[PDB]
Design a protein around this nucleic acid. Structure first.
Ligand SMILES: [Mg+2]
Ligand SMILES: [Mg+2]
Ligand SMILES: [Mg+2]
Ligand SMILES: [Mg+2]
Ligand SMILES: [Mg+2]
Ligand SMILES: [Mg+2]
Ligand SMILES: [Mg+2]
Ligand SMILES: [Mg+2]
Ligand SMILES: [Mg+2]
Ligand SMILES: [Mg+2]
Ligand SMILES: [Mg+2]
Ligand SMILES: [Mg+2]
Ligand SMILES: [Mg+2]
Ligand SMILES: [Mg+2]
Ligand SMILES: [Mg+2]
Ligand SMILES: [Mg+2]
Ligand SMILES: [Mg+2]
Ligand SMILES: [Mg+2]
Ligand SMILES: [Mg+2]
Ligand SMILES: [Mg+2]
Ligand SMILES: [Mg+2]
Ligand SMILES: [Mg+2]
Ligand SMILES: [Mg+2]
Ligand SMILES: [Mg+2]
Ligand SMILES: [Mg+2]
Ligand SMILES: [Mg+2]
Ligand SMILES: [Mg+2]
Ligand SMILES: [Mg+2]
Ligand SMILES: [Mg+2]
Ligand SMILES: [Mg+2]
Ligand SMILES: [Mg+2]
Ligand SMILES: [Mg+2]
Ligand SMILES: [Mg+2]
Ligand SMILES: [Mg+2]
Ligand SMILES: [Mg+2]
Ligand SMILES: [Mg+2]
Ligand SMILES: [Mg+2]
Ligand SMILES: [Mg+2]
Ligand SMILES: [Mg+2]
Ligand SMILES: [Mg+2]
Ligand SMILES: [Mg+2]
Ligand SMILES: [Mg+2]
Ligand SMILES: [Mg+2]
Ligand SMILES: [Mg+2]
Ligand SMILES: [Mg+2]
Ligand SMILES: [Mg+2]
Ligand SMILES: [Mg+2]
Ligand SMILES: [Mg+2]
Ligand SMILES: [Mg+2]
Lengths: 119, 82
RNA sequence: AGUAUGAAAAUGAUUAUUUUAUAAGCAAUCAUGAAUAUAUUAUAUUAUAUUAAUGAUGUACCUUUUGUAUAAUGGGUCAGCAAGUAAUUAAUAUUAGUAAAACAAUAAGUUAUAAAUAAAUAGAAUAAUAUAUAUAUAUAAAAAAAUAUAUAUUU
RNA sequence: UAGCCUUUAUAAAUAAUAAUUAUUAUAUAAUAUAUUAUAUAAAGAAUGGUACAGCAAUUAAUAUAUAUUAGGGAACUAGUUUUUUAAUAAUAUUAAAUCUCGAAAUAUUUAAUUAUAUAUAAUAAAGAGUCAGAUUAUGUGCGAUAAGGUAAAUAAUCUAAAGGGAAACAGCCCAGAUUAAGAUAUAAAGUUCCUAAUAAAUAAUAAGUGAAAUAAAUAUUAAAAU
RNA sequence: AAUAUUUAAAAUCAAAUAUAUAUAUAUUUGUUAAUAGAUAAUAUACGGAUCUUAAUAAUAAGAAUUAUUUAAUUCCUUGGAAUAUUAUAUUUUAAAAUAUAAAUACUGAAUAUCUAAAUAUUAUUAUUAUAAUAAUAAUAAUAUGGUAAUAGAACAUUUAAUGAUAAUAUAUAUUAGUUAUUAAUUAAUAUAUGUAUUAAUUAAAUAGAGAA
RNA sequence: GAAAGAAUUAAAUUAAUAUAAUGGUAUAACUGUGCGAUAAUUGUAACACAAACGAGUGAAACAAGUACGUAAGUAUGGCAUAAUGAACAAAUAACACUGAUUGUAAAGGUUAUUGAUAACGAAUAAAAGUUACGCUAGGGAAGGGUAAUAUAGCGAAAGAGUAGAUAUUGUAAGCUAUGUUUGCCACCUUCGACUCAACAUUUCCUCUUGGUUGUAAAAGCUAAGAAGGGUUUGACUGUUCGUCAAUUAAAAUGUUACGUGAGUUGGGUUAAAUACGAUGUGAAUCAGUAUGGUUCCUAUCUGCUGAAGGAAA
């Protein structure tokens, strides 16, 4: 290994904060998507925008992917997530079966919340 | 109701399927704002690119001209010709 | 190796301005003091020009390579010279001329005007769009594959 | 030659790209134990056999004061018991590139709908170049679970991409330079000084451990929980 | 206290979210540290300085390491409210009371916006003179890194065809201006020439050299 | 209640399939049996799959004829996926198409068939070696990485040690370091001697110290600190190495382009000459042996050794 890819094995505090913020943003996006759908469905039934926003009973999304994203068991929120799953991917060939998320290529775009139950 | 979607991240490190989805959605460059009438189809498409994009719901959409007008900064002066 | 002329450059010496004897690397660019020069509108607290205070950024150029600051190629510098051109043809395209004809006008020829078929004495609505017709295979004649021909004016 | 690139055009043109709907079940309401609507749940039309999971059949491995089949010993007067040797059965437990009876996600992929049209496909007439590739990540073959190794699979970047970060850096993290301007949002990465930018909270460390390239079995000393 | 394990949130408990809801069901989260082991040849090598805090005593420092977090702290549902803080002003006796503010952490690209300029296309205009056009100028949008390659548009140079003009001119050179500038033009200065095969349009090329 | 039939359910594709392996097959594609021996036929084949082209694959339908079946229908070889070869040039037939003045002919064409190019998209009907006498065009189409090996260490301790695993020893298996050996990779196209050495410490000697029923003493053995100083001369060989001789306090191990050829040498390795043994028909060749035998360099910069001038004191 003569070429030096000087990437540290762990993240800095600032990196971790940025990661957390990014995670929070994707959750927010999902929430917005569900909310807009609900609003649209209220409008279709025949309420005003404000009335729809007020509504006690929020409509859950019917499409599959959205419904999965909504579930925390499948796609957890940043507040829900463990410290470890925010900053460590599962890597079967690593010692500890764990690897920094920053070592994943395009980790800033690519999402990866859920690790295996005991790894 | 309308999703105001914004292409927050670039499409440089992004695979080709996700690029194609972004193109279909209508977003060109980074930070280029697009309003979309809400429906299941557009919602699913947005979910597919959830990490590149910032979405927020709105009462009304805005045409490109309106958006431009909103953007324009205040010229702090009033011309008086003589 | 003509004759004039020659502030063309490389190159040498000298003078002037400016910087330089505690500072380290493509010697430039950008920031920025100072010094000097010029300026018949510097009215100035001015403008331009020249100059390695000081600060920041800055890994020659080409070639060949997956990849070159490379200790890979090539160049001492400047001046001059040094590389997709012609002929005879064919196919496309664009325009222009003429146009069911064109070129040529002496005739002759080339292309077009009919599609086929290895080739032969075969060759396009019997009452209309293919469901008709022509050709090649086949045949008594159709059907069948293929391509072509037809819905005031021929293309 | 095809693949990928370019130019000029053609339409009774959207055929392209992306997603949704499509299914199953439950509850509620309305009609005729069925149908429709609404809401919710379910990795949700069709195709599949990798991961995972599993030991079924196949191929392999282990154990039985268990049973049967024979054999070798052994005690009394050929019969009999025990300590057994293998095989077979029974029961329990295990694994495999060429085992999958269970089984994902990603994937392949169809209709209509919506969204992309200052956008795509297809076709027609013409021009190319290229066929030494590299690294990173993931899943493998070879190698020794060695190589800046080698061989291909998928994605990205470099190739041909300047800019910010990673001390310096082809391939990593961001992000694509038409020309400026420099007020505002920022990305990745940073905020004691060098060096543009910082203040807090709660724990732990005392080894300069560490502070952007994490060195192992094991040992000692503590600390919690039982 | 002693012996022996484990270093765990599966179970268990605690806390939080979602469905009927003072409870039940389902989901999500929470379970050690230090040292030794430790190791080669130009020179210490976190990039370097340097970083672990301390009462008296500061209008003042107290990780710049590791782990979990925040953008002053606490409740309620990004937002408001309360709480103290900090700074400031006023009033009263260096303190107290009142009120105003700050709470949007910041840096950061050739990213995006704004601000202007250019070209190209699409869609609207305006002005001036296939007028369904051309030129120029507006507005909105999209696009403009590029090797191999493809396509489009220009300029310099030399010759041929046509061709005014003139030493107050032309050409070449130097210096300083000008025009979004390989080019040309203005002025000054110099040297030549009684003068552009000149401007412009065509036709062509021994038509552009830091790379053999 | 009994007999017979029709059968259904469960299981099975582990047998069998002309033939490998895979998929399929009991609704059988497997097996038996009647007829038959035909469809192991003739012209057009769309449309798909696959696909650079050349080819390859499935195939509806139309037309002619055939075999089986009461009929429905089925058959354009085999349950499927291998069982193969272009043109050119010859050859054989059929076709009635051309017939170089006309007629015949020849010769060519169409249709069907034939043999191989296995380096198997086949260059020709037909082609092996050698060069250290070689030549031209190009390409690189010890250092670096690795650490299997090697060297060193650690953990655990079977076992030796008169008794006791751990004074000293330490099987096989375990965890590391090193980049000193032999390899592997292919980014990257000279051994020894002399001379002068610089550095490391994993210490051979000298200094300090722990352990040593195996430290009585003296010699040792083993371990910790320690790089200040020191660490060989000869015979043999080109050798480093090694064997030995004589010494020494000791004759340590490396790194430095296995330091040092613009500093020396040139014995080894190395081309031209020649011979020997072996190999080859031979030219010639060799992880062979032997004699002979070719590079040079005035120092520009860095650096180092000395010596001046200038200077800001
Ligand atoms: Mg000085
Ligand atoms: Mg110097
Ligand atoms: Mg050099
Ligand atoms: Mg060079
Ligand atoms: Mg040279
Ligand atoms: Mg016939
Ligand atoms: Mg090609
Ligand atoms: Mg469609
Ligand atoms: Mg497999
Ligand atoms: Mg199965
Ligand atoms: Mg290749
Ligand atoms: Mg490689
Ligand atoms: Mg290249
Ligand atoms: Mg770059
Ligand atoms: Mg690119
Ligand atoms: Mg761009
Ligand atoms: Mg340290
Ligand atoms: Mg380090
Ligand atoms: Mg739990
Ligand atoms: Mg060091
Ligand atoms: Mg640092
Ligand atoms: Mg920009
Ligand atoms: Mg461009
Ligand atoms: Mg020339
Ligand atoms: Mg020249
Ligand atoms: Mg040039
Ligand atoms: Mg068979
Ligand atoms: Mg079988
Ligand atoms: Mg296909
Ligand atoms: Mg084909
Ligand atoms: Mg059969
Ligand atoms: Mg031949
Ligand atoms: Mg004749
Ligand atoms: Mg061949
Ligand atoms: Mg071949
Ligand atoms: Mg060949
Ligand atoms: Mg041959
Ligand atoms: Mg010889
Ligand atoms: Mg090495
Ligand atoms: Mg013993
Ligand atoms: Mg051993
Ligand atoms: Mg003694
Ligand atoms: Mg030592
Ligand atoms: Mg001393
Ligand atoms: Mg001697
Ligand atoms: Mg050497
Ligand atoms: Mg030398
Ligand atoms: Mg040298
Ligand atoms: Mg002699």
């Amino acid at each position: 290994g003569g070429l030096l890819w000087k990437i540290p094995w762990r993240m800095s505090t600032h990196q971790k904060t940025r990661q957390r913020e990014r995670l929070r943003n994707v959750d927010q996006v999902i929430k917005q998507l569900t909310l807009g759908l609900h609003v649209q469905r209220c409008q279709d039934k025949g309420l005003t925008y404000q009335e729809a926003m007020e509504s006690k009973k929020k409509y859950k999304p019917r499409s599959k992917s959205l419904r999965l994203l909504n579930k925390p068991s499948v796609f957890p929120k940043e507040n829900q997530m463990s410290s470890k799953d925010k900053y460590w991917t599962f890597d079967k060939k690593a010692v500890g079966y764990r690897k920094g998320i920053h070592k994943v290529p395009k980790w800033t775009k690519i999402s990866i919340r859920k690790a295996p139950k005991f790894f | 109701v309308f999703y105001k979607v914004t292409l927050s991240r670039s499409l440089i490190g992004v695979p080709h399927t996700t690029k194609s989805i972004v193109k279909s959605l209508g977003l060109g460059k980074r930070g280029s704002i697009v309003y979309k009438k809400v429906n299941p189809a557009i919602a699913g498409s947005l979910a597919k690119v959830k990490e590149l994009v910032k979405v927020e719901v709105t009462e009304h959409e805005l045409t490109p001209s309106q958006q431009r007008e909103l953007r324009k900064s205040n010229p702090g002066f009033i011309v008086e010709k003589r």
